[model samples]
Target: AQYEDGKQYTTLEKPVAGAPQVLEFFSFFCPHCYQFEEVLHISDNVKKKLPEGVKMTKYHVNFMGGDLGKDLTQAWAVAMALGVEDKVTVPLFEGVQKTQTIRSASDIRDVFINAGIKGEEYDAAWNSFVVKSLVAQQEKAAADVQLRGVPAMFVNGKYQLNPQGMDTSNMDVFVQQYADTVKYLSEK
Candidate 1:
């Protein structure tokens, strides 16, 4: 129940102003991230529990370091920019993990289609200069951080909720760890 900065988590060099920032570093293809997404779905759980003025974001990482990784990362960024991340994120993960229907960027578009993003909108968002730039920014952000793996949480860009020594097998415990870390950091 005790959360100490630097031991339980560390602060960011450049902490956000006016509010705490909670960012989840993840990949759609990562099995752990796929599981964590359920806890964070905006309807009724962790997302609702987030403190006021907390800036939450999902950092889509290119963990696999290949065309597929880049493709998926770009897809995530596009969905985010188009304001469809809430709609597409879980389905995208399911498409990749369960149905295995998303093997490439084109297939990724289909997931968005299934999520209600029109083809024209998807094309513009997927290929627009701004979306590509945001994807590159996320890639750079992911590289800039000392992220050990997926399903990691960065609070205020400072404190990191690491899973070491925690019950990695239980999703509820994992979310509790994250929630505790966020509460601990918000007090600072």
Candidate 2:
């Protein structure tokens, strides 16, 4: 499919180890990211097609939702630490985009609560050193790449996917091409 550099992907100057890691930098306030998950379900589809041991990791970006952006990123980290992302992601998105209910960390905590996570558990994870470090790492990763937007996909922390280079005529073709590009970069 002629996955050329600067076309299908951009090679990072400071590449991270751990080949085959599909790291997605996204934001709950990003409409495109919301569509990517809730409408297209691209991540779920891509995950099923990825090679074994390859995992798609989501890193929430701290650049949207104004002051709430950092809080949302922290909320995401807390979810990740608690292994409840699958439960809270969509609701959080809904709260931010649809319901327009989430305005602070307290609201984020409520989303976790709605997802059946205890308030004490959420509080523990929110203030834990692990979650704090994860938030810091996410912020640094975005800065290292000079990230300008959300819903960005990087393969193995080296090859950043160029959605413009893919055939986006239809969802089927787009998903196939997207998965193909990710697979190729993962193997490379």
Candidate 3:
């Protein structure tokens, strides 16, 4: 929620309203993010079993700042805000990761259309205030947060996840300990 402009580091330190919180910075089309989904789902299930209000807000970051990143995150933001992410996100991941083709804008829309989003609705959502806000957030996060790469992690404001701690192979580990990290930050 804090969507205002100017503060570029907001992604590295998103404000959480509850007892403790987590932010998962990810790219929608990244193979690692895709592979990590199942693992993260398990982690989320385990985490949600905890006491209520352990909020984890996930950002589909476009920090690559490529046209590819922009278009993909725009579509991703659309699917997320429109509430059809289950349909869109996986298709996107599959299309990019499995085919050996580098992800690009033109190839993604059909997957969105296949995912039950009407073309017009997709258009509207892609251009919607939600999509715009996400795009803006990515820019702010990159410039302000000084992000060096994709799939960064943050637990409260205490520490930022570094390279060795998070990567494709160990993403489940990253996701699993996040709530614990939230607990850690809360107690600190």
Best by lDDT: 2
> Scored by Cα lDDT, where does model 3 land?
0.58
Per-residue lDDT for 7-76 in model 1, tens only? 5676667654432266677887788677667654422344556677766777788866478888988888
Superposed Cα deviation of residue 182, candidate 2 (Å)? 0.7
Off by over 4 Å in 2: 17-20
What are the Cα lDDT values of the candidates?
Answer: 0.71, 0.85, 0.58
Candidate 1's error at 110, in angstroms?
Answer: 0.8
* Sort order, lDDT high to low: 2, 1, 3
TM-score of 1: 0.84
Can you write out model 3's per-residue Cα lDDT over 98-174, one digit (the tens) per residue?
76354566578788777677889888877688789876765664454455666655555434544343234665554
Q: Which parts of model 1 have CA positions greater than 4 angstroms off?
A: 11-20, 39-45, 167-170
Clashes of each: 4, 0, 2
Q: Once model 2 is optimally superposed onto the true structure by TM-score, how far is the C-alpha of residue 63 displaced, in angstroms?
A: 1.0
Give the CA lDDT, 0 to 100, for residue 59 in model 3: 63
User: What TM-score does each of the candidates earn?
Assistant: 0.84, 0.92, 0.68
